[PDB]
Design an enzyme around this catalytic site. Structure first.
Site, PDB file in Angstrom:
ATOM      1  N   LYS A  17     -21.482  -0.638 -18.765  1.00  0.00           N
ATOM      2  CA  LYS A  17     -22.075   0.379 -17.534  1.00  0.00           C
ATOM      3  C   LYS A  17     -22.047   2.146 -18.056  1.00  0.00           C
ATOM      4  O   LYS A  17     -23.125   3.019 -17.420  1.00  0.00           O
ATOM      5  CB  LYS A  17     -20.273   0.330 -17.348  1.00  0.00           C
ATOM      6  CG  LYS A  17     -19.981  -0.440 -15.708  1.00  0.00           C
ATOM      7  CD  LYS A  17     -18.295  -0.706 -15.742  1.00  0.00           C
ATOM      8  CE  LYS A  17     -18.258  -2.107 -15.491  1.00  0.00           C
ATOM      9  NZ  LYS A  17     -15.976  -2.328 -15.407  1.00  0.00           N
ATOM     10  N   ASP A 130      -9.464  -6.910 -20.895  1.00  0.00           N
ATOM     11  CA  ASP A 130     -11.174  -7.121 -21.253  1.00  0.00           C
ATOM     12  C   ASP A 130     -11.677  -8.384 -21.172  1.00  0.00           C
ATOM     13  O   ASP A 130     -12.729  -7.336 -22.256  1.00  0.00           O
ATOM     14  CB  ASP A 130     -12.187  -5.569 -20.698  1.00  0.00           C
ATOM     15  CG  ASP A 130     -12.768  -5.811 -19.835  1.00  0.00           C
ATOM     16  OD1 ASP A 130     -13.340  -6.218 -19.126  1.00  0.00           O
ATOM     17  OD2 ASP A 130     -13.663  -5.273 -20.994  1.00  0.00           O
TER      18      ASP A 130
HETATM   19  N1  LIG Z   1     -21.630  -5.085 -32.355  1.00  0.00           N
HETATM   20  C1  LIG Z   1     -22.855  -6.078 -31.125  1.00  0.00           C
HETATM   21  N2  LIG Z   1     -24.227  -6.688 -31.665  1.00  0.00           N
HETATM   22  C2  LIG Z   1     -24.866  -6.859 -30.547  1.00  0.00           C
HETATM   23  N3  LIG Z   1     -24.406  -6.644 -29.181  1.00  0.00           N
HETATM   24  C3  LIG Z   1     -23.575  -5.914 -29.051  1.00  0.00           C
HETATM   25  C4  LIG Z   1     -23.084  -5.390 -29.721  1.00  0.00           C
HETATM   26  N4  LIG Z   1     -21.980  -4.384 -28.638  1.00  0.00           N
HETATM   27  C5  LIG Z   1     -22.460  -4.071 -27.912  1.00  0.00           C
HETATM   28  N5  LIG Z   1     -23.156  -5.316 -28.075  1.00  0.00           N
HETATM   29  C6  LIG Z   1     -24.645  -5.847 -26.539  1.00  0.00           C
HETATM   30  O1  LIG Z   1     -24.410  -4.450 -25.588  1.00  0.00           O
HETATM   31  C7  LIG Z   1     -23.274  -4.850 -24.392  1.00  0.00           C
HETATM   32  C8  LIG Z   1     -22.479  -4.174 -23.665  1.00  0.00           C
HETATM   33  O2  LIG Z   1     -21.231  -3.592 -25.011  1.00  0.00           O
HETATM   34  P1  LIG Z   1     -20.035  -2.895 -24.515  1.00  0.00           P
HETATM   35  O3  LIG Z   1     -18.811  -4.472 -23.337  1.00  0.00           O
HETATM   36  O4  LIG Z   1     -19.197  -2.572 -26.289  1.00  0.00           O
HETATM   37  O5  LIG Z   1     -20.340  -2.265 -23.485  1.00  0.00           O
HETATM   38  P2  LIG Z   1     -20.022  -1.829 -22.247  1.00  0.00           P
HETATM   39  O6  LIG Z   1     -19.088  -2.670 -21.435  1.00  0.00           O
HETATM   40  O7  LIG Z   1     -20.657  -0.919 -21.192  1.00  0.00           O
HETATM   41  O8  LIG Z   1     -17.842  -1.043 -22.416  1.00  0.00           O
HETATM   42  P3  LIG Z   1     -17.050  -0.726 -22.275  1.00  0.00           P
HETATM   43  O9  LIG Z   1     -16.391  -1.502 -21.527  1.00  0.00           O
HETATM   44  O10 LIG Z   1     -15.522   0.231 -23.095  1.00  0.00           O
HETATM   45  O11 LIG Z   1     -17.017   0.578 -21.355  1.00  0.00           O
HETATM   46  C9  LIG Z   1     -23.053  -6.421 -24.385  1.00  0.00           C
HETATM   47  O12 LIG Z   1     -22.721  -7.129 -23.845  1.00  0.00           O
HETATM   48  C10 LIG Z   1     -23.478  -7.054 -25.986  1.00  0.00           C
HETATM   49  O13 LIG Z   1     -24.347  -7.386 -24.718  1.00  0.00           O
HETATM   50 MG   LIG Z   2     -17.917  -4.561 -21.689  1.00  0.00          MG
END
Ligand SMILES: Nc1ncnc2c1ncn2[C@@H]1O[C@H](COP(=O)(O)OP(=O)(O)OP(=O)(O)O)[C@@H](O)[C@H]1O
Ligand SMILES: [Mg+2]
Ligand SMILES: O=C(O)c1cc(-c2cccc(Br)c2)nc2ccccc12
Length: 264
Positions: A17, A130
């Protein structure tokens, strides 16, 4: 302690997001990591600057092998960066897209890893909230690793943020806004267990609206290839009443888990 000028950025690893996650290396030590970049503007508009702060506080104080390490953070004038452990085998979401569905061995193993990391979290009274295949990452040995503690809170709790994602993983009490505790994660664990074997979550629909209905009513049906033992564990976790859901030991020792799960 850190700034951007200490890291060599690389290929985007993924997106969610509020900003991309990037492969990166620490110039001095040569440490490979993942850099989670978030834009401040977007965190202001959507009212989730607190989620990010807790993400950091909860996650930094967590040491278990089935949980992704946060090593720190720093910020710019316009962006926040989280320094994460890098999961080189990608996500459980991607694996499910390649293979369509997982066998019982892979499922019972993933579930085992999940329950363990949840046991750990629930022992510090932390709920993830989540648990989504997109946030289950795979390490170099193929091991599962819970990511994304944006939604995680100290139990018990109420929801003070409009969950504006898919409700497929959320139990009734959390969508209904009602209070909740660690039982929320056991409902999610059954949705995963369903999705792993079936491929698709068990309340999927083309609208949020029907998804709500199906959840609040608990309307799922099993394809023929789901075995009695898998059905029994899933049926045991997807109960409306959070008090009636089992403990994580009952998951770990469930016959179907013990017979299919491949422990170390
Ligand atoms: N440590 C990691 N290694 C490899 N890929 C990752 C890693 N962290 C995140 N990703 C990739 O980035 C994507 C989004 O990351 P993440 O879920 O942390 O962010 P987000 O959903 O936008 O965060 P939040 O829900 O806390 O606001 C993951 O689904 C994955 O595909
Ligand atoms: Mg996520
Ligand atoms: O403007 C700031 O100073 C700011 C800072 C941060 C911040 C700073 C340090 C750590 C973390 Br987590 C978040 N988050 C924001 C999130 C949204 C908007 C602004 C901010």
């Amino acid at each position: 302690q850190w700034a951007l000028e200490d890291f060599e950025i690389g290929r985007p690893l993924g997106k969610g997001k509020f900003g991309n996650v990037y492969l990166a290396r620490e110039k001095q030590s040569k440490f490979i990591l993942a850099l989670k970049v978030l834009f401040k503007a977007q965190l202001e508009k959507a009212g989730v600057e607190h989620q990010l702060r807790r993400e950091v506080e909860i996650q930094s104080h967590l040491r278990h092998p089935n949980i992704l390490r946060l090593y720190g953070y720093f910020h710019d004038a316009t962006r926040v960066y989280l320094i994460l452990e890098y999961a080189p085998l990608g996500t459980v979401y991607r694996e499910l897209q390649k293979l369509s569905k997982f066998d019982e061995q892979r499922t019972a193993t993933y579930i085992t890893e999940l329950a363990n990391a949840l046991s750990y979290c629930h022992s510090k009274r932390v709920i993830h909230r989540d648990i989504k295949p997109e946030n289950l990452l795979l390490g170099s040995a193929g091991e599962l690793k819970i990511a994304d503690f944006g939604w995680s809170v100290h139990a018990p709790s109420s929801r003070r943020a409009t969950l504006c994602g898919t409700l497929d993983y959320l139990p009734p009490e959390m969508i209904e806004g009602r209070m909740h505790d660690e039982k929320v994660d056991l409902w999610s664990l059954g949705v995963l267990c369903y999705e792993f074997l079936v491929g698709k979550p068990p309340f999927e629909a083309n609208t949020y609206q029907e998804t709500y209905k199906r959840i609040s009513r608990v309307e799922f049906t099993f394809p023929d290839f789901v075995t009695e033992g898998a059905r029994d564990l899933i049926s045991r976790l997807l109960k409306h009443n959070p008090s009636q859901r089992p403990m994580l030991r009952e998951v770990l020792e469930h016959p179907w888990i013990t017979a299919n799960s491949s422990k170390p």
